[model samples]
Structure formats: structure tokens, C-alpha cells
Target chain A: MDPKISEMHPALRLVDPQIQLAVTRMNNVGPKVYPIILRLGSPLSLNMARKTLNSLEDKAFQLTPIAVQMTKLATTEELPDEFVVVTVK
Target chain B: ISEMHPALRLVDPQIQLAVTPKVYPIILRLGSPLSLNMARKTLNSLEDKAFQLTPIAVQMTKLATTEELPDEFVVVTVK
Candidate 1:
């Protein structure tokens, strides 16, 4: 039988890079890019991104409902075939 | 990182296989104590980088400096 495939590792390790970028970006953006990524990218990848918004999201709740100015990072030349492919049966 | 190992260079069909659902793990190693916050952070750090092979991964360790594609597959073809 063909083996079933699963997404590698756990959700935690899965979104590392995004989180690293967001925190630094948010801190750097100071008040620029908080709500930008809040609603961008694929919902699935967004799921991978929520963890990052949380930090500033929390700060927002404490302050105001307005989304902080979130900026986008244009990295990668392509969507990359291997990127979306997780595991298959 | 030197492309010393068979998989290090991440060339060709080997890349295709690595292109599977579990593919990210081929480069992004899994970490313990998962948290949405931490995961996002790590992924952010992963941005801009050309991706990295797993620390203990020997997926491409079998190939020498100069080799062919089809043959690279026959050797070190994952577990």
C-alpha cells in the first residue's frame, strides 16, 4: 500500500521563519506594519502566520482596535514547487 | 551548506521528492514545544534564506562533487 503523507514536524517548527521576520519587523515598524499581514497570504499560510500577529495584536487590544501598519517582505523568486508540497500518498 | 552532501545542493528530482507535503521538513527541521507564536517566529527567520537541510539529514550525502541527475536518485534515495 502507498503510505500516507503528513506535514513535517509540528505547527510550531512549521512557522519559524515568518515569526522571526514579523517580530523584528513589528518592532522595527514600531507603528507601521501591524495589520498588513493580518489579512494577506493564503488562509492556510495565514494560519501559519497568526502566531506572529498575536504579539502586536495583544498590544493593539491593550491600546486600540486599529491594525498596526504591517509591511510585506518580498522574498523568494518563486512560489516554489516544493514549498506547498507537504507529503502525499 | 557547501553542497558537499548529495542533498545539500538540493538539485533536481531529489528536489521533486523533497517537494512532497513533508517537504519543508527536508529543509526546516522540526522543533519541540510547538507554539503558534514560536512557529511563526521561526518561519520568519526562515525568510530570505535559500532554506537549509536538516542537521542530521544525509539525504544527499552519497553524491560526489561531479555527478549525474538520474544516478543521484539511485543513490541516497531517502528512507
Candidate 2:
């Protein structure tokens, strides 16, 4: 977890965290994609975890945080779990 | 997913389940309107054969592979 990623503003954070990780991890990349995975997962988990989101019932864990946040910023997400909530459109 | 019609959205955010733009097209190509029962049955069938798709295996693989095509798509050397 790089300290610099967390320091980014919320608006930027609203973008794909993986993109941020891709930018940061670019300087320190290896053959594998683990750094980008970590970069995306960190803020993603942080944001959803902050929302106090629990199980989505039938739809336990499908969407990733980076995807979720990007949609929210792009659209205007509303719910946590639905057969098809369509938070953004 | 606008906050409007909060009941349905709150209870279930469909966009949260949407495929990311990068792979959304791929998903649309590979996906179908599957009933939960059929989907679970397909996943459960993995355990019966030598594959053993247990709860942990399914969860782990779900995280590992977005393509969810059973044993073939799932093969990635867990060890």
C-alpha cells in the first residue's frame, strides 16, 4: 500500500484506483500485475468498507470497488445489492 | 445508480454488479440470462468431478477468474 495513493483527493480517488496504481506502479513494476492489483484493491476495499456495505445477499461479491466507484462518479449510484440495482446506468 | 427510488437501489445496486467497461463487452458476449439455480448447479457440479469446487474454491476462483467457465476456465494451478 503506497502512502501516496491514500493521500490523493476524494475526486481523484473516485476514478479507477487501478489507473492510479498503474501510474504509480509504472515506476516500480515487475513482470507480474500484482502491484496494479494491490493498487486497485487498496482504495477499493477502503471505500466500500467505509460505506459499511455488508453482504449483497444473493449477489455476494461480484463487483470490484474500483469498478463501483468509477460508476458512482460517472453516474450516480444508489444501492448496495440488487438483482440489478443499476446505480449508475 | 442514482439515489432515486432508494428502496430498490438500496436493497440492490445493479451497477455494482455490472462488468467494468474494459470487459463489459466481453462479458456481454460470454454471458446469458442464467437463473441462479442453474448457475449454482453448474458451479456445484465442479466439486463432484475430480475438480472439487468447494465453498472456498468457488469463492477463491470467483475472485481469481472473472470468466467463470468452470474447470477449464478455472485451471490456473492453485498450488
Candidate 3:
């Protein structure tokens, strides 16, 4: 890992691996339209990530919500998890 | 408990899984030449949105081409 990547905030680190992977995969296929895959751990985390993405200053970026599903907890309750795909131009 | 964001509430469920946690990867494309300071600021802002949530990570990389995209968009990805 690069020193600069290591110095990033803890929250940012959670999605760094997926970003790197996305870049590698994009490079291998010859870029057309590649996106970053952020695999968050929980519903709350997913919401935070989505809010961050939505709050981006750039208006050109497009954020699309692909799917959301319910996850069961040990306490016999359920919460929603989601997948969001964002395209940056 | 935190309420789901209005934007997220509209998404329909697409799959079912066992009791284990699911890893839904978010796909995004970012332009290059993003400064480390800007990336850090974006992450800090995300932290302020919630407490004790899982940490998100970021990396800066030079893309293979910039014919259609500009450096300014890099901040959009980081932001």
C-alpha cells in the first residue's frame, strides 16, 4: 500500500481496497466506463457512504442505487443493506 | 437506530442471502491527479456524517487516459 493511502482517514480506508481493485480491473479491460465498488459492512455504513457520495461538490458525477436487501441480526430483527454504483466523468 | 436516507428507501430488494453479512460493492470511476489533502478532507466529512460506523477507504491513481475526462472531476470522486 502507498504511504499516502495509509495516511487517509480510517473511514476512507474501508473503501480503498475496492477502489484500487476497480482501477486495476478498469485498466485491464481498457477504460470505457468503469466504476468503484464500495462494499460497506452494515446498513448505517451504507447510508453514510451514500450520503458522502451524494454530497460531492461535482454535479457531473452520477450516483445510481442498484439494489437493497434486508439483513438479519442475532436479535431477531432486520435492517437494510444496499449497493450504490457511482460514475465519475 | 438511524433512519434510512430518503434516497435509499426507494431501492427495491434484488436478492436474498443467508443470515451472514452481505458485501455490496459500489462501482465508481474517478479521474486522476487528486491531491492527498482533498481526499483526506472528503473522508473527514464522511466521518462527521455518522458515529462509530465502519471506516471507508480511498486511493489516488493515474488513469490510463484523460482524453474525455479532466482533473477537476477527480475532486468530484473524492468529494
Identify the candidate with maximal DockQ.
3
lDDT of 3 by residue, A2-81 (tens): 23322322212132222221121232552121222222221221211232233235424333432333221222011112
The runs of at least 3 residues in candidate 3 whose Cα sits more than 4 Å from the true structure, single-residue gaps closed, are: A1-3, A15-89, B1-8, B15-79
Q: Which runs in model 2 stand beyond 4 Å of their true positions?
A: A1-11, A17-43, A46-89, B1-11, B21-79
Across A1-89, the per-residue lDDT of candidate 1 in tens digits comes to 11211221211112222221211214244211111111111222111111222342242112111112323333333222122212211
After TM-score superposition, the amount by which residue B5's alpha carbon in candidate 1 deviates from its true location, in angstroms, is 54
CAPRI tier for the interface of model 1? incorrect
Local distance difference test, each candidate: 0.22, 0.19, 0.23
Give one digit per residue, the lDDT tens place, for model 2 in A3-78.
Answer: 3333423222233334221111125652211111111211222112121233344222333233334532222121
Chain A TM-score from candidate 3? 0.17
Q: What lDDT is reached at residue B62 by model 2? A: 20
Models 1 onward score TM values of 0.15, 0.15, 0.17
**Winner of 1 and 2 under TM-score:** 1
* Higher-ranked by DockQ: 1 or 3: 3
Query: Tens digits of per-residue lDDT for model 2 on B1-79?
Result: 1221211111111111112211111111101111110001222232231112222111111222222321111011100
**Which digits, one per residue and each the tens of the lDDT, describe model 3 over residues B1-79?**
0232121111111211111223322322222222111111112232232112322234323333223232112112222
Residue A6 error, candidate 3, Å? 2.4
Question: C-alpha displacement of A46 in model 2, angstroms?
Answer: 10
Ranking by lDDT: 3, 1, 2
Error of 1 at A64 (Å): 3.6
